[PDB]
């Protein structure tokens, strides 16, 4: 058998991403789950790269966020990416939940 099936971890990546049998007739509303995974990776990465500069004291919280917005190189990129990506995280989450409510993805197996 193939190495993507015989390995310990590549069998997981294969059976979730590569050979995962999807029905042929699903539409672009089924893209929102992968989009939510993308939102989560965006949020976690921009969050770590701002936590390297943020200070959580009550005298330095707002001053440190403004330090990110002014002193940190491309820190405005990270802050606006984190904030508007959280808004987009919740947009795509409402679309995921609404397509679940619509197409009956909550019923007996699931």
């Amino acid at each position: 058998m193939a190495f993507r099936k015989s390995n310990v971890y590549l069998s997981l990546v294969n059976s979730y991403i590569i050979d995962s049998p999807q029905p042929s007739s699903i539409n672009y509303w089924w893209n929102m789950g992968s989009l939510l995974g993308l939102c989560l990776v965006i949020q976690i990465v921009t969050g770590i790269f701002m936590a390297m500069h943020y200070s959580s004291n009550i005298e330095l919280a707002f001053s440190s966020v403004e330090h990110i917005m002014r002193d940190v190189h491309n820190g405005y990129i990270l802050r606006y990416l984190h904030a508007n990506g959280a808004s987009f995280f919740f947009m795509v989450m409402f679309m995921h939940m609404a397509k679940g409510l619509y197409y009956g993805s909550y019923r007996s197996p699931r």
């Binding site: 029905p23 042929s24 007739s25 009956g104 019923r107 007996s108 197996p109």
Partner: protein, 126 residues
């Protein structure tokens, strides 16, 4: 989740009454025409969600020609909705073609399961 015996009971009561028939049957016919499953080549008993043991029982008990035809209608509806079109107007399921073919098998498996549960929970009169 709603048992098919209950749907048959309520629908038979509506159909056996002369006032309820002439009041609600055209509403259901226009509802079925607006539902639009016939434009994809599906009869309604292809639409019933099969992921429950009563429906798995009825689908096991379906004869083979109906099974092969149902398989073709399901695959054809998947390909049709993949291409984001409908079937052409001569490939639509006609009204006289939309017969409940799975329904006696569903109702028989439902009566068997209800009788099995009722005998599982009996109380002998002593």
């Amino acid at each position: 989740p709603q048992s098919f015996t209950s749907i048959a009971r309520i629908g038979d009561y509506i159909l056996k009454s002369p006032v309820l028939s002439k009041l609600c049957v055209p509403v259901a016919n226009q509802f079925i025409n607006l539902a639009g499953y016939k434009k994809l080549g599906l009869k309604f008993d292809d639409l019933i969600a099969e992921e429950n043991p009563i429906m798995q029982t009825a689908l096991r008990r379906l004869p083979e020609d109906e099974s092969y035809a149902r398989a073709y209608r399901i695959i054809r509806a998947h390909q049709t909705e993949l291409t984001h079109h409908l079937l052409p107007r001569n490939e639509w399921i006609k009204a006289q073609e939309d017969v409940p073919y799975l329904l006696p098998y569903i109702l028989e498996a439902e009566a068997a399961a209800k009788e099995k549960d009722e005998l599982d929970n009996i109380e002998v009169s002593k």
